[PDB]
């Protein structure tokens, strides 16, 4: 297994076609999972699945601009279960990274970061096992 938390450097940042994939198990337990594409200290793209929110399951995405948290952009469809092995496919599009799970499209976030080749880092953390993060070109 990678060591969490992971830093997958995405080089010369993102651009439209980018595809990072992401594989891993979750924890039996889990309470949180996160990955940050990140510009410097600022995060572009939060995706943040919340095993436990008010006895709720959600993911919270929102970005992190000079320490501050943004609006948040809610999901309730939940595709992670502890213990199950998991795929995170996030594609980069003109205007907006479009995520699927295990093959079933989740969401999409528009670009709040336009920068996108300063966003240069991913990082991933929390209740998982990782067993890989790569990026290709589609
Ligand atoms: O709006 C999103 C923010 O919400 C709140 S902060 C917030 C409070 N009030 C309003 C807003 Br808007 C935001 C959280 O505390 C933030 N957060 C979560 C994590 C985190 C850290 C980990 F190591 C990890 F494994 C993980 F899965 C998640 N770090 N920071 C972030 O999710
Ligand atoms: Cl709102
Ligand atoms: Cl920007
Ligand atoms: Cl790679």
Known sequence: ??????NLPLPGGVVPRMLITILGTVKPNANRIALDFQRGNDVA???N??????NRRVIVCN???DNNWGREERQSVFPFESGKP???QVLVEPDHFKVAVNDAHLLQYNHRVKKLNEISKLGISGDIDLTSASYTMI
Request: aromatic share 24%; no cysteine; proline share 10%.
């Open 45 to 47: 793209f939060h995706f």
């Open 49 to 54: 699945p919340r095993f436990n929110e008010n």
């Open 86 to 88: 998991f795929k995170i």
């Open 63 to 65: 970005t992190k601009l």
């Open 1 to 6: 297994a990678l060591i969490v938390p992971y």
